[PDB]
Design a protein around this ligand. Structure first.
Ligand SMILES: OC[C@H]1CN[C@H](O)[C@@H](O[C@@H]2O[C@H](CO)[C@@H](O)[C@H](O)[C@H]2O)[C@@H]1O
Length: 273
């Protein structure tokens, strides 16, 4: 069965996880959290314990604001990486780790499309492989590696697979994508789940790895979010057969992505999962 996940809009304490399960009316199979590259495992541990105590898998998006691909490739973050690997091995439990995500965009300082041009496919791949090498050298085979793309290539030099580090370094591929509706002054439009995800999925479906929808959500404005949710999950089950997990992004942020942005959205979400 499709694994159901979320970023719940806050750090996943025991009570945040339980509250989201009451909200969506179902267990969370996967709990998503975001951390940077100046956060040690000791800070993660009480969250990880809440996730595992609930019978869920923790997925961490591990964001190197503090080191770009050149820094990482060159070994300048290795002390930090090594401690994380040691600590995660000692912890022992199955963790899905998603480092250097959305690198086919232009908004992160490790991304290929980032305006300084410092990150290339070569430096990205070398960085990703270097991280995985350190984890394996430290015995952290409990850590599963998640490659990621944004649904669209944004910025110069970006592509779905140019930065792919190889099947020997990846356990899961993944896609992030949003229906922005008409909410953005950059001229956004309502897009169905297919309109958002199909192109990236076709590219990743060429790789013999399972796929996670690591982040998705819909706006309320410009269409019927309840129907979008119903149709999204139908589409995942019907036509995105390599997808093994769907992880909503539940936060009132750029727009109201939450599953409870309206009562009707919530009801549709509860039924869809
Ligand atoms: O633009 C919508 C989302 C696209 N995917 C990004 O990963 C999201 O940004 C992350 O959001 C989390 C949760 O708010 C932050 O902790 C991360 O630092 C951030 O990169 C983005 O909101």
């Amino acid at each position: 069965g499709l694994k159901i996940g979320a970023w719940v809009g806050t750090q996943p304490s025991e009570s945040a996880i339980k509250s989201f399960q009451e909200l969506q009316g179902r267990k969370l199979d996967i709990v998503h959290q975001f951390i940077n590259w100046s956060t040690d495992f000791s800070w993660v541990r009480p969250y990880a314990d809440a996730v595992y105590n609930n019978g869920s898998i923790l997925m961490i998006t591990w964001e190197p604001w503090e080191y770009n691909t050149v820094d990482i490739k060159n070994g300048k973050a290795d002390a930090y990486i090594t401690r994380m690997a040691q600590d995660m091995k000692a912890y022992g439990k199955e963790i899905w780790l998603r480092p250097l995500h959305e690198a086919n965009g232009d908004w992160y300082p490790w991304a290929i499309g980032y305006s300084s041009r410092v990150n290339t496919n070569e430096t990205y791949i070398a960085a990703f492989r270097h991280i995985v090498d350190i984890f394996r050298a430290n015995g952290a085979t409990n850590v599963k590696w998640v490659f990621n793309v944004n649904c669209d290539n944004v910025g110069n030099g970006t592509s779905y697979l140019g930065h792919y580090p190889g099947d020997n370094y990846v356990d899961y591929t993944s896609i992030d994508g949003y229906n922005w509706g008409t909410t953005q002054s950059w001229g956004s439009q309502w897009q169905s789940f297919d309109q958002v995800f199909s192109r990236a999925y076709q590219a990743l479906a060429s790789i013999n790895k399972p796929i996670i929808i690591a982040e998705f959500a819909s706006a309320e404005i410009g269409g019927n979010k309840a129907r979008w949710i119903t149709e999204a999950y139908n589409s995942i089950r019907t036509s995105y057969n390599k997808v093994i997990a769907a992880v909503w992004f539940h936060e009132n942020k750029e727009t109201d992505w939450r599953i409870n942005s309206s009562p009707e959205a919530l009801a549709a979400y509860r039924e869809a999962i």
